Amino acid sequence: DPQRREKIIQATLEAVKLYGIHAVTHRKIATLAGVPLGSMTYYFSGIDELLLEAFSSFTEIMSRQYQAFFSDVSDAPGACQAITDMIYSSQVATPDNMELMYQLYALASRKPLLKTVMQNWMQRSQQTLEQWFEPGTARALDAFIEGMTLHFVTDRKPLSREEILRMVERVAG
Amino acid sequence: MRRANDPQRREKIIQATLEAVKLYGIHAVTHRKIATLAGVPLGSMTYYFSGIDELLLEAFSSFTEIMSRQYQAFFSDVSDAPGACQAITDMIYSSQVATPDNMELMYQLYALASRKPLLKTVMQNWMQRSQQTLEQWFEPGTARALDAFIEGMTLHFVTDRKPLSREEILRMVERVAG
């Protein structure tokens, strides 16, 4: 029962990866969840609220990962090393994470509820960084993470770890 | 020699492909959907582009070529590093890059690229062009840091409930520039 609701949230993310958000429906999700169609009506209302809750679950997973990179951080230089680790490890920009994250980004202009999820997600990230950095620098760093996590796993010749550290430290001021 | 490669059908098909991605989502686009949008016979589809991935390749390559011309255009009046930082700030603060239309296409490309090597190639080529633009005024390492910063901050600027000011952005760009 809470089992089932969670299966449906997960199948929603699975449907986004398999079908694209545009093509996601209650029945496609129920199929992937292996639950009766009736369960969709029981736990959820509209496809957009379901998308909201599924992507919120996803970003919460991401936030826990994000924070975990700073578990051994006690100061700004340490946070720079942690951000470097976050980028260089390629653990944030995995195929699964990218496929979900960028579909969210793709449709946020068309779906206000999803833009809210992105904004909330950015806000949590900033809040993590504000433990060691000024608000503005925190935002700069999180945008730098956004771009460099992706570019690191895409570039035919990405930056070295020591190069990444130097650039993180530049942004950190 | 079965194939004829008509350039008219091609450009039509390429535009219909981009239209299909926005209508249906990149995951759901098929030859059938594209040909219907193009107004070309479904049969013609495989004789310009083998399959769905190579068609997507061509269409997104067309898209990023447009993006790159826009990108380079921000540097028309740049002759030094401070001017370049201004141009980058312009690019971010103008919100002209991260438009709804642009974001919808670009992030769908990004989303599917780990699953589709040809699409990753499009991203890789696009990054390389951006870097070569920046490398006129910045060392390669710094150029990559700046382009990644542009990637992230163009999105964050149009998304954040409370985004950075222009002076803040310029300051950070100048930090990255070193």
Swiss-Prot record, chain A:
SUPFAM superfamilies: Homeodomain-like (SSF46689), Tetracyclin repressor-like, C-terminal domain (SSF48498)
One GO MF term attached to the UniProt entry: DNA-binding transcription factor activity
Triggers of expression: Autoregulated.
Gene3D superfamilies to which the protein is assigned, alphabetical: Tetracycline Repressor, domain 2 (1.10.357.10)
Superkingdom of source: Bacteria
DNA-binding region (UniProt annotation): 25-44
Pfam families, per the entry: TetR_C_31, TetR_N
Boundaries of every HTH tetR-type domain copy: 2-62
Keywords: DNA-binding, Transcription, Transcription regulation
Disulfide bonds: none
InterPro entries found in the cross-reference section: Homeodomain-like_sf, HTH_TetR, Tet_transcr_reg_TetR-rel_C_sf, TetR_C_31
Any single biological process term in GO: positive regulation of DNA-templated transcription
PROSITE patterns on file: HTH_TETR_2 (PS50977)
Keyword Transcription: yes
Miscellaneous comment text of the record: Has a strong cooperative DNA-binding mode, leading to aggregation of RcdA-DNA complexes.
Function: Regulates the expression of a number of genes involved in biofilm formation and stress response. Target genes include six stress-response transcriptional regulators: csgD, which is a master regulator of biofilm formation, appY, sxy, ycgF, fimB and rcdA itself. This indicates that a large number of genes must be regulated indirectly via these transcriptional regulators. Acts by binding to the upstream region of its target genes.
Name listed for the protein in its UniProt record: HTH-type transcriptional regulator RcdA
Swiss-Prot record, chain B:
Note: Has a strong cooperative DNA-binding mode, leading to aggregation of RcdA-DNA complexes.
Keywords assigned by UniProt, alphabetized: DNA-binding, Transcription, Transcription regulation
GO MF annotations, alphabetized: DNA binding; DNA-binding transcription factor activity
The HTH tetR-type domain, residue ranges: 7-67
InterPro entries: Homeodomain-like_sf, HTH_TetR, Tet_transcr_reg_TetR-rel_C_sf, TetR_C_31
Annotated region of DNA binding: 30-49
This protein's name: HTH-type transcriptional regulator RcdA
Stated induction or repression of this protein's expression: Autoregulated.
One of the protein's GO biological processes: DNA-templated transcription
Function: Regulates the expression of a number of genes involved in biofilm formation and stress response. Target genes include six stress-response transcriptional regulators: csgD, which is a master regulator of biofilm formation, appY, sxy, ycgF, fimB and rcdA itself. This indicates that a large number of genes must be regulated indirectly via these transcriptional regulators. Acts by binding to the upstream region of its target genes.
Provenance organism: Escherichia coli (strain K12)
Coiled-coil zones: none
Stored Pfam families: TetR_C_31, TetR_N
